[PDB]
Amino acid sequence: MKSNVQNDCRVTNPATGHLFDLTSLKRESGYTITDSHNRKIELNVCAEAKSSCANGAAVCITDGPKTLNAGKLSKTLTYEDQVLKLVYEDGDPCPTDLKMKHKSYFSFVCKSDAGDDSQPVFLSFDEQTCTSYFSWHTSLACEEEVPR
């Protein structure tokens, strides 16, 4: 489908035959959830954040009033294990490992109901390796089951 098309942000998975887009779910501001502890995960499904961080940060972990860039805008969709994968990397280097950047893997998984307007869950945030894994339940993500 296509609601807000930031350039593209779509991949046709040859294994499914369905085109996965995240244009339908993206909105200019961003989406909101809560982090592992207190913090607000303010990220956009495949676009840049409006107020969630600043501009080019797609995934930003808002600790109070302090925005932690978890990953830059990566509107590149990949497919793996029947789940839609977007890798939002290139962010604020953590004190745990300064020699690499924050690796935030977002897994977009299709669910028939998808919750209260395609809601995500923080899967695991591993500051130990400065990675973040989140799972978003959305109908545009994949199609192993009918999420419509």
CSV table of N, CA and C in Angstrom, one decimal:
chain,number,residue,atom,x,y,z
A,1,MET,N,0.9,-1.2,0.0
A,1,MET,CA,0.0,0.0,0.0
A,1,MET,C,0.9,1.2,0.0
A,2,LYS,N,0.4,2.4,0.0
A,2,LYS,CA,1.2,3.6,0.2
A,2,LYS,C,0.4,4.8,0.8
A,3,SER,N,0.8,5.2,2.0
A,3,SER,CA,0.1,6.4,2.6
A,3,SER,C,1.1,7.6,2.5
A,4,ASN,N,2.2,7.5,3.2
A,4,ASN,CA,3.2,8.6,3.1
A,4,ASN,C,4.5,7.9,2.6
A,5,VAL,N,4.9,8.3,1.4
A,5,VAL,CA,6.0,7.7,0.8
A,5,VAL,C,7.3,8.5,0.9
A,6,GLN,N,8.1,8.2,1.8
A,6,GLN,CA,9.4,8.9,2.0
A,6,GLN,C,10.3,8.2,1.0
A,7,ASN,N,10.4,8.8,-0.2
A,7,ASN,CA,11.2,8.3,-1.3
A,7,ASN,C,10.7,6.9,-1.8
A,8,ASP,N,10.8,5.9,-1.0
A,8,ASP,CA,10.4,4.6,-1.3
A,8,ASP,C,10.0,3.9,-0.1
A,9,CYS,N,10.9,3.2,0.6
A,9,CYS,CA,10.6,2.4,1.8
A,9,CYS,C,9.6,1.3,1.5
A,10,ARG,N,10.1,0.4,0.6
A,10,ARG,CA,9.3,-0.7,0.2
A,10,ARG,C,10.1,-1.8,-0.5
A,11,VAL,N,9.8,-3.0,-0.2
A,11,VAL,CA,10.5,-4.1,-0.8
A,11,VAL,C,9.5,-5.2,-1.1
A,12,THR,N,9.6,-5.8,-2.3
A,12,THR,CA,8.8,-6.9,-2.7
A,12,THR,C,9.6,-8.2,-2.4
A,13,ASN,N,9.1,-8.9,-1.4
A,13,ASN,CA,9.8,-10.1,-1.0
A,13,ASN,C,9.3,-11.2,-2.0
A,14,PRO,N,10.3,-11.7,-2.8
A,14,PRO,CA,10.0,-12.7,-3.8
A,14,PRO,C,9.5,-14.0,-3.3
A,15,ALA,N,9.8,-14.3,-2.0
A,15,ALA,CA,9.4,-15.5,-1.3
A,15,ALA,C,7.9,-15.4,-0.9
A,16,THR,N,7.4,-14.2,-0.7
A,16,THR,CA,6.0,-14.0,-0.3
A,16,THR,C,5.2,-13.6,-1.5
A,17,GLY,N,5.7,-12.7,-2.4
A,17,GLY,CA,5.0,-12.3,-3.5
A,17,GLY,C,4.2,-11.0,-3.1
A,18,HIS,N,4.4,-10.6,-1.9
A,18,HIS,CA,3.8,-9.4,-1.4
A,18,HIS,C,4.8,-8.3,-1.2
A,19,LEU,N,4.4,-7.1,-1.6
A,19,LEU,CA,5.2,-6.0,-1.4
A,19,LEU,C,5.1,-5.4,0.0
A,20,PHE,N,6.1,-5.3,0.7
A,20,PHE,CA,6.1,-4.8,2.0
A,20,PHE,C,6.4,-3.3,1.9
A,21,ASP,N,5.6,-2.5,2.5
A,21,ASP,CA,5.8,-1.1,2.6
A,21,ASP,C,5.7,-0.7,4.0
A,22,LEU,N,6.3,0.4,4.3
A,22,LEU,CA,6.1,0.9,5.7
A,22,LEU,C,5.7,2.4,5.5
A,23,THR,N,5.1,2.7,4.3
A,23,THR,CA,4.7,4.0,4.0
A,23,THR,C,3.3,4.3,4.5
A,24,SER,N,2.6,3.2,4.6
A,24,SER,CA,1.2,3.3,5.1
A,24,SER,C,1.2,3.6,6.6
A,25,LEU,N,2.2,3.1,7.3
A,25,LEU,CA,2.2,3.2,8.8
A,25,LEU,C,3.0,4.4,9.2
A,26,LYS,N,3.8,5.0,8.4
A,26,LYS,CA,4.7,6.1,8.8
A,26,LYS,C,3.9,7.4,8.8
A,27,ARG,N,4.3,8.2,9.7
A,27,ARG,CA,3.7,9.5,9.9
A,27,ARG,C,4.8,10.5,10.2
A,28,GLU,N,4.7,11.7,9.9
A,28,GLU,CA,5.8,12.7,9.9
A,28,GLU,C,6.4,12.9,11.3
A,29,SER,N,5.5,12.8,12.3
A,29,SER,CA,6.0,13.0,13.7
A,29,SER,C,6.8,11.8,14.2
A,30,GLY,N,6.2,10.6,14.3
A,30,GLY,CA,6.9,9.4,14.7
A,30,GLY,C,5.9,8.6,15.5
A,31,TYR,N,6.4,7.5,16.0
A,31,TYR,CA,5.6,6.6,16.8
A,31,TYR,C,6.2,6.5,18.2
A,32,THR,N,5.4,6.1,19.1
A,32,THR,CA,5.9,6.1,20.5
A,32,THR,C,5.5,4.9,21.2
A,33,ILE,N,6.5,4.5,22.0
A,33,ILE,CA,6.5,3.4,22.9
A,33,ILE,C,7.4,3.7,24.1
A,34,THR,N,7.5,2.7,25.0
A,34,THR,CA,8.4,2.9,26.2
A,34,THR,C,9.6,1.9,26.1
A,35,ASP,N,10.7,2.4,26.6
A,35,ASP,CA,12.0,1.6,26.6
A,35,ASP,C,12.0,0.7,27.8
A,36,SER,N,13.0,-0.2,27.8
A,36,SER,CA,13.3,-1.2,28.8
A,36,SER,C,13.2,-0.6,30.2
A,37,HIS,N,13.6,0.6,30.5
A,37,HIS,CA,13.5,1.2,31.8
A,37,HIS,C,13.2,2.7,31.7
A,38,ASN,N,11.9,3.1,31.9
A,38,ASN,CA,11.5,4.5,32.1
A,38,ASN,C,11.3,5.2,30.7
A,39,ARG,N,12.4,5.3,30.0
A,39,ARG,CA,12.6,6.0,28.8
A,39,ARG,C,11.5,5.8,27.8
A,40,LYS,N,11.3,6.7,26.9
A,40,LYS,CA,10.4,6.7,25.8
A,40,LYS,C,11.0,6.4,24.5
A,41,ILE,N,10.6,5.4,23.8
A,41,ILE,CA,11.2,5.1,22.6
A,41,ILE,C,10.4,5.9,21.5
A,42,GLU,N,11.0,6.8,21.0
A,42,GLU,CA,10.4,7.6,20.0
A,42,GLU,C,11.1,7.4,18.7
A,43,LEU,N,10.4,6.7,17.8
A,43,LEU,CA,11.0,6.3,16.6
A,43,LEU,C,10.0,6.3,15.5
A,44,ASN,N,10.4,6.4,14.3
A,44,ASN,CA,9.5,6.4,13.2
A,44,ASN,C,9.7,5.1,12.4
A,45,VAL,N,8.6,4.5,12.0
A,45,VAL,CA,8.6,3.1,11.4
A,45,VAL,C,9.5,2.9,10.2
A,46,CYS,N,9.9,4.0,9.6
A,46,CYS,CA,10.8,3.9,8.4
A,46,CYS,C,11.0,5.4,7.8
A,47,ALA,N,11.0,6.3,8.7
A,47,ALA,CA,11.1,7.7,8.3
A,47,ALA,C,11.9,8.4,9.4
A,48,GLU,N,12.1,9.6,9.2
A,48,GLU,CA,12.8,10.5,10.1
A,48,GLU,C,11.8,11.0,11.2
A,49,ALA,N,12.3,11.3,12.4
A,49,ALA,CA,11.5,11.7,13.5
A,49,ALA,C,11.3,13.2,13.4
A,50,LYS,N,10.2,13.7,13.7
A,50,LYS,CA,9.9,15.1,13.7
A,50,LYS,C,10.3,15.7,15.0
A,51,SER,N,9.8,15.3,16.1
A,51,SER,CA,10.1,15.8,17.4
A,51,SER,C,10.7,14.8,18.3
A,52,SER,N,10.6,13.5,17.8
A,52,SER,CA,11.1,12.4,18.6
A,52,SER,C,12.6,12.4,18.9
A,53,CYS,N,13.3,13.1,18.1
A,53,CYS,CA,14.7,13.3,18.3
A,53,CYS,C,15.1,14.6,17.8
A,54,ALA,N,15.4,14.7,16.5
A,54,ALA,CA,15.7,15.9,15.8
A,54,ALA,C,15.2,15.9,14.4
A,55,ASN,N,16.0,15.5,13.5
A,55,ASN,CA,15.7,15.3,12.1
A,55,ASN,C,15.9,13.9,11.6
A,56,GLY,N,17.2,13.6,11.2
A,56,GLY,CA,17.6,12.4,10.6
A,56,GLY,C,17.6,11.1,11.5
A,57,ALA,N,17.4,11.3,12.7
A,57,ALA,CA,17.4,10.1,13.6
A,57,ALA,C,16.0,9.5,13.5
A,58,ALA,N,16.0,8.2,13.1
A,58,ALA,CA,14.8,7.5,13.0
A,58,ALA,C,14.4,6.8,14.3
A,59,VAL,N,15.3,6.2,14.9
A,59,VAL,CA,15.1,5.6,16.2
A,59,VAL,C,15.8,6.4,17.3
A,60,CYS,N,15.1,7.0,18.2
A,60,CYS,CA,15.7,7.8,19.2
A,60,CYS,C,15.1,7.4,20.6
A,61,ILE,N,16.0,7.1,21.5
A,61,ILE,CA,15.6,6.6,22.8
A,61,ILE,C,15.6,7.9,23.6
A,62,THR,N,14.4,8.3,24.0
A,62,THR,CA,14.3,9.5,24.8
A,62,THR,C,14.3,9.2,26.3
A,63,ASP,N,15.4,9.4,26.9
A,63,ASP,CA,15.5,9.3,28.3
A,63,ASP,C,15.2,10.6,29.0
A,64,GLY,N,14.0,10.7,29.5
A,64,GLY,CA,13.6,11.9,30.0
A,64,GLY,C,13.5,13.0,28.9
A,65,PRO,N,14.3,14.1,29.0
A,65,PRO,CA,14.4,15.0,28.0
A,65,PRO,C,15.6,14.8,27.1
A,66,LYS,N,16.3,13.8,27.3
A,66,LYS,CA,17.6,13.5,26.6
A,66,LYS,C,17.4,12.4,25.5
A,67,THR,N,17.5,12.9,24.3
A,67,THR,CA,17.3,12.0,23.2
A,67,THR,C,18.6,11.3,22.8
A,68,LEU,N,18.6,10.0,22.9
A,68,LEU,CA,19.7,9.1,22.5
A,68,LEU,C,19.5,8.5,21.1
A,69,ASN,N,20.2,9.0,20.2
A,69,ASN,CA,20.2,8.5,18.8
A,69,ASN,C,20.6,7.1,18.7
A,70,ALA,N,19.6,6.2,18.5
A,70,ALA,CA,19.8,4.8,18.4
A,70,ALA,C,20.2,4.4,17.0
A,71,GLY,N,19.6,5.0,16.0
A,71,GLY,CA,19.9,4.7,14.7
A,71,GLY,C,19.4,5.8,13.8
A,72,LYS,N,20.1,6.0,12.7
A,72,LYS,CA,19.8,7.0,11.7
A,72,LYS,C,18.6,6.5,10.8
A,73,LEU,N,18.0,7.4,10.1
A,73,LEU,CA,17.0,7.0,9.2
A,73,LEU,C,17.5,6.0,8.2
A,74,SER,N,17.0,4.8,8.2
A,74,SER,CA,17.2,3.8,7.3
A,74,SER,C,15.9,3.3,6.7
A,75,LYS,N,15.6,3.8,5.5
A,75,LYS,CA,14.4,3.5,4.9
A,75,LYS,C,14.6,2.3,3.9
A,76,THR,N,15.6,1.5,4.3
A,76,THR,CA,15.9,0.3,3.5
A,76,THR,C,15.3,-0.9,4.2
A,77,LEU,N,14.4,-1.6,3.6
A,77,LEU,CA,13.8,-2.8,4.1
A,77,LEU,C,14.4,-4.0,3.7
A,78,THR,N,14.6,-5.0,4.6
A,78,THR,CA,15.2,-6.2,4.2
A,78,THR,C,14.2,-7.3,4.7
A,79,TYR,N,14.4,-8.5,4.1
A,79,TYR,CA,13.5,-9.6,4.5
A,79,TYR,C,14.4,-10.7,5.1
A,80,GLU,N,13.9,-11.3,6.2
A,80,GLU,CA,14.5,-12.4,6.9
A,80,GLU,C,13.6,-13.1,7.8
A,81,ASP,N,13.6,-14.4,7.7
A,81,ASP,CA,12.8,-15.3,8.6
A,81,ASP,C,11.3,-15.0,8.6
A,82,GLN,N,10.8,-14.5,7.4
A,82,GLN,CA,9.4,-14.1,7.1
A,82,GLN,C,9.0,-12.8,7.9
A,83,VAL,N,10.0,-12.2,8.4
A,83,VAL,CA,9.8,-10.9,9.1
A,83,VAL,C,10.5,-9.8,8.4
A,84,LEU,N,9.9,-8.6,8.5
A,84,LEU,CA,10.5,-7.5,7.8
A,84,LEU,C,11.6,-6.9,8.7
A,85,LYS,N,12.8,-6.7,8.2
A,85,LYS,CA,13.9,-6.2,9.0
A,85,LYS,C,14.4,-4.9,8.5
A,86,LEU,N,14.5,-3.9,9.4
A,86,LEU,CA,15.1,-2.7,9.1
A,86,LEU,C,16.2,-2.4,10.1
A,87,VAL,N,17.4,-2.1,9.6
A,87,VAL,CA,18.5,-1.9,10.5
A,87,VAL,C,18.8,-0.4,10.7
A,88,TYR,N,18.5,0.1,11.8
A,88,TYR,CA,18.8,1.5,12.1
A,88,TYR,C,20.0,1.5,12.9
A,89,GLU,N,21.1,1.7,12.2
A,89,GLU,CA,22.4,1.8,12.9
A,89,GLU,C,22.9,3.2,12.7
A,90,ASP,N,24.1,3.4,13.0
A,90,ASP,CA,24.8,4.7,12.9
A,90,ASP,C,24.1,5.7,13.8
A,91,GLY,N,24.5,5.6,15.0
A,91,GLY,CA,23.9,6.5,16.0
A,91,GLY,C,24.9,6.9,17.0
A,92,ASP,N,24.5,7.2,18.2
A,92,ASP,CA,25.4,7.7,19.3
A,92,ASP,C,26.2,6.5,19.8
A,93,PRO,N,27.5,6.6,19.7
A,93,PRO,CA,28.4,5.6,20.2
A,93,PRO,C,28.3,5.5,21.7
A,94,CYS,N,28.1,4.3,22.2
A,94,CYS,CA,27.8,4.0,23.5
A,94,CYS,C,29.2,4.0,24.3
A,95,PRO,N,29.2,4.2,25.6
A,95,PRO,CA,30.4,4.2,26.4
A,95,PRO,C,30.9,2.7,26.6
A,96,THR,N,29.9,1.8,26.3
A,96,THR,CA,30.2,0.4,26.4
A,96,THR,C,31.1,-0.1,25.3
A,97,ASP,N,30.8,0.4,24.1
A,97,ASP,CA,31.6,0.1,22.9
A,97,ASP,C,31.6,1.3,22.0
A,98,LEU,N,32.7,2.0,22.0
A,98,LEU,CA,32.8,3.3,21.3
A,98,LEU,C,33.3,3.1,20.0
A,99,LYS,N,33.7,1.9,19.7
A,99,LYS,CA,34.4,1.5,18.5
A,99,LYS,C,33.5,1.1,17.4
A,100,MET,N,32.2,1.1,17.8
A,100,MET,CA,31.2,0.8,16.9
A,100,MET,C,30.0,1.7,17.2
A,101,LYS,N,29.0,1.5,16.5
A,101,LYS,CA,27.8,2.3,16.7
A,101,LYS,C,26.7,1.5,17.2
A,102,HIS,N,25.7,2.2,17.6
A,102,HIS,CA,24.5,1.5,18.1
A,102,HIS,C,23.8,0.7,17.0
A,103,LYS,N,23.5,-0.5,17.2
A,103,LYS,CA,22.9,-1.4,16.2
A,103,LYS,C,21.5,-1.7,16.6
A,104,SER,N,20.5,-1.0,16.0
A,104,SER,CA,19.1,-1.2,16.3
A,104,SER,C,18.4,-1.9,15.2
A,105,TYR,N,18.0,-3.1,15.5
A,105,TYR,CA,17.3,-4.0,14.6
A,105,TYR,C,15.8,-4.0,14.9
A,106,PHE,N,15.1,-3.6,13.9
A,106,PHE,CA,13.7,-3.5,14.1
A,106,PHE,C,13.1,-4.6,13.2
A,107,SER,N,12.3,-5.4,13.9
A,107,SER,CA,11.6,-6.5,13.3
A,107,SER,C,10.1,-6.2,13.1
A,108,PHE,N,9.7,-6.1,11.9
A,108,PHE,CA,8.3,-5.8,11.7
A,108,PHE,C,7.6,-7.1,11.4
A,109,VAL,N,6.7,-7.5,12.3
A,109,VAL,CA,6.0,-8.8,12.2
A,109,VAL,C,4.5,-8.5,12.1
A,110,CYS,N,4.0,-9.3,11.2
A,110,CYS,CA,2.6,-9.2,10.8
A,110,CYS,C,1.7,-9.9,11.8
A,111,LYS,N,0.6,-9.2,12.3
A,111,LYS,CA,-0.3,-9.8,13.2
A,111,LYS,C,-1.7,-9.4,12.7
A,112,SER,N,-2.6,-10.3,12.8
A,112,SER,CA,-4.0,-10.1,12.3
A,112,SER,C,-4.7,-8.9,12.9
A,113,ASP,N,-4.5,-8.6,14.2
A,113,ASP,CA,-5.1,-7.5,14.8
A,113,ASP,C,-4.1,-6.3,14.9
A,114,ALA,N,-2.9,-6.7,15.2
A,114,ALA,CA,-1.7,-5.7,15.3
A,114,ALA,C,-1.8,-4.8,16.5
A,115,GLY,N,-2.8,-5.0,17.4
A,115,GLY,CA,-2.9,-4.2,18.6
A,115,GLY,C,-3.6,-2.9,18.3
A,116,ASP,N,-3.4,-2.0,19.1
A,116,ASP,CA,-4.0,-0.7,19.0
A,116,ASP,C,-3.3,0.2,18.1
A,117,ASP,N,-3.6,0.0,16.9
A,117,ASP,CA,-3.0,0.8,15.7
A,117,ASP,C,-1.6,0.4,15.5
A,118,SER,N,-1.4,-0.9,15.1
A,118,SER,CA,-0.1,-1.4,14.8
A,118,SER,C,0.9,-1.0,15.9
A,119,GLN,N,0.9,-1.7,17.0
A,119,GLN,CA,1.7,-1.4,18.1
A,119,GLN,C,3.0,-2.3,18.2
A,120,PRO,N,4.1,-1.7,18.5
A,120,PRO,CA,5.3,-2.4,18.7
A,120,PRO,C,5.6,-2.8,20.2
A,121,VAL,N,6.5,-3.7,20.4
A,121,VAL,CA,7.0,-4.1,21.7
A,121,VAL,C,8.5,-4.1,21.7
A,122,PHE,N,9.1,-3.6,22.7
A,122,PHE,CA,10.5,-3.6,22.8
A,122,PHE,C,10.9,-5.0,23.1
A,123,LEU,N,11.7,-5.6,22.2
A,123,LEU,CA,12.0,-7.0,22.3
A,123,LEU,C,13.1,-7.2,23.3
A,124,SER,N,14.2,-6.6,23.0
A,124,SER,CA,15.4,-6.6,23.9
A,124,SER,C,16.3,-5.4,23.6
A,125,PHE,N,16.7,-4.7,24.6
A,125,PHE,CA,17.7,-3.7,24.4
A,125,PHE,C,18.9,-4.1,25.1
A,126,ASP,N,20.0,-4.3,24.4
A,126,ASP,CA,21.2,-4.8,25.0
A,126,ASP,C,22.2,-3.7,25.0
A,127,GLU,N,22.4,-3.0,26.1
A,127,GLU,CA,23.4,-2.0,26.2
A,127,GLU,C,24.8,-2.6,26.2
A,128,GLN,N,24.8,-3.9,26.6
A,128,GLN,CA,26.1,-4.7,26.7
A,128,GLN,C,26.8,-4.7,25.3
A,129,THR,N,26.0,-4.8,24.3
A,129,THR,CA,26.5,-4.8,23.0
A,129,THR,C,25.9,-3.7,22.1
A,130,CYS,N,25.3,-2.8,22.8
A,130,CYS,CA,24.7,-1.5,22.3
A,130,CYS,C,23.7,-1.8,21.1
A,131,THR,N,23.1,-2.9,21.2
A,131,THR,CA,22.1,-3.3,20.2
A,131,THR,C,20.7,-3.1,20.8
A,132,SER,N,19.8,-3.1,19.9
A,132,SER,CA,18.4,-2.9,20.3
A,132,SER,C,17.6,-3.7,19.3
A,133,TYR,N,16.7,-4.5,19.8
A,133,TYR,CA,15.8,-5.3,19.0
A,133,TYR,C,14.4,-4.9,19.4
A,134,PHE,N,13.6,-4.6,18.4
A,134,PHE,CA,12.2,-4.3,18.7
A,134,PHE,C,11.4,-5.0,17.7
A,135,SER,N,10.2,-5.4,18.1
A,135,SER,CA,9.3,-6.1,17.2
A,135,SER,C,7.9,-5.3,17.1
A,136,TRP,N,7.6,-4.9,15.9
A,136,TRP,CA,6.5,-4.1,15.6
A,136,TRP,C,5.4,-5.0,15.0
A,137,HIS,N,4.2,-5.0,15.5
A,137,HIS,CA,3.1,-5.8,14.9
A,137,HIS,C,2.4,-4.9,13.9
A,138,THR,N,2.5,-5.2,12.7
A,138,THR,CA,1.9,-4.4,11.6
A,138,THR,C,1.5,-5.3,10.4
A,139,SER,N,0.5,-4.9,9.7
A,139,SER,CA,0.0,-5.7,8.6
A,139,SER,C,0.8,-5.6,7.3
A,140,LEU,N,1.5,-4.5,7.2
A,140,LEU,CA,2.3,-4.2,6.0
A,140,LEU,C,3.7,-4.9,6.0
A,141,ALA,N,4.0,-5.3,7.2
A,141,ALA,CA,5.3,-5.9,7.5
A,141,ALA,C,5.6,-7.2,6.7
A,142,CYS,N,4.7,-8.2,6.9
A,142,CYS,CA,4.9,-9.5,6.3
A,142,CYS,C,3.6,-10.1,5.9
A,143,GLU,N,3.6,-11.3,5.4
A,143,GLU,CA,2.4,-11.9,5.1
A,143,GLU,C,2.6,-13.5,5.1
A,144,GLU,N,2.7,-14.0,6.3
A,144,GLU,CA,2.8,-15.5,6.4
A,144,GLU,C,1.4,-15.9,6.9
A,145,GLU,N,0.7,-15.0,7.5
A,145,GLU,CA,-0.6,-15.1,8.0
A,145,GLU,C,-1.3,-13.9,7.5
A,146,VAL,N,-2.6,-13.9,7.5
A,146,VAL,CA,-3.4,-12.8,7.0
A,146,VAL,C,-3.5,-11.7,8.1
A,147,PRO,N,-2.8,-10.6,8.0
A,147,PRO,CA,-2.8,-9.6,9.0
A,147,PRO,C,-3.8,-8.5,8.7
A,148,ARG,N,-4.6,-8.8,7.7
A,148,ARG,CA,-5.6,-7.9,7.2
A,148,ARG,C,-6.9,-8.3,7.8
